[PDB]
Amino acid sequence: KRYIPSVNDFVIGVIIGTFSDSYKVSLQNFSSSVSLSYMAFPNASKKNRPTLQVGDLVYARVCTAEKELEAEIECFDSTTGRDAGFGILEDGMIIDVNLNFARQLLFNNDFPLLKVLAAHTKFEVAIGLNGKIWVKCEELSNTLACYRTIMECCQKNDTAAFKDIAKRQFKEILT
Amino acid sequence: KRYIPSVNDFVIGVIIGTFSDSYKVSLQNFSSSVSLSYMAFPNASKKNRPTLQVGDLVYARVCTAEKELEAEIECFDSTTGRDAGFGILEDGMIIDVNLNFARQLLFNNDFPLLKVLAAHTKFEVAIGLNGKIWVKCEELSNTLACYRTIMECCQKNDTAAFKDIAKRQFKEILT
Description:
2 copies of one chain form a homodimer.
Chain A: E1 10-18, E2 22-26, E3 34-37, E4 57-64, E5 72-74, E6 87-89, E7 93-96, H1 99-107, H2 113-118, E8 124-128, E9 132-136, H3 140-156, H4 162-169
Parallel strand pairs in A: 3-5
Antiparallel strand pairs in A: 1-2, 1-4, 2-3, 4-5, 4-6, 7-9, 8-9
Helix pairs in contact in A: 3-4
Main location (chains A, B): cytoplasm
GO biological process, one term (chains A, B): CUT catabolic process
Protein name (chains A, B): Exosome complex component RRP40
């Protein structure tokens, strides 16, 4: 069960190349890359061009995933035309997780992890269904605590243990 | 039928004052202002403070609207902790619309206006249920065409005329 791009999936990739009219983006190692058009951004034109570079993390939406063709991703909201959280992810940390964990985090409102984290710290989170969680707090120590917490929660997949895992991981943090 | 803040409403306001720990924000003229805490932003703390000023337009979410108290708005996503399109609205144009028009635009996927506009130009749109639409295109002429189109569509409220209104308003624009 390696990740297969399907349409409308939110994913986190890394820019692995810049080409004439698109980025090559990796959603997982040892897998085929996906394509991010330079036009796939808010109000994008040949004048209004993106400025991402190799090694940048990007949050995106799978827009096409045809059989036997390179899948394509986009970094804007189809309805509003706005970034809506898609685009570059800066100054945060990535946790690699199993695909079910990511799916739970994105779609299950009863999944208690975000609520557990929120009791300890303010954070920003982006959830890639390709098995990557991105997290960022104001303070590095808080970001790190979220990183370790999310990683340990994923490995244990015991939702009742999440609260205790976070409590331990945030032990030396005022909040 | 003037706008009454209710919880979870997306609204567009203008910063009318800056205070010690919040902005005073107007959602409509001749109405009571609402309150935007300096903490009501992504990863906000007393160090990580917002930089909005009087006259700035803001997209926000009504978070509290108690009876006989000043309503409160926020500029982040409660789940993700990210801006999610909330915050400052720059370099676009505002159309004042009736509250039903805004409600239709935000909630009705069959309402054909956005699709009608999209056939003519790429745009960014934000919809305030307080009766304000914000639109922005790369080119000023396109932004203006969207502005006039949205305004005329609202006054006529004849969804079948939308296509023709846009066609006329975008007459001198290559797209």
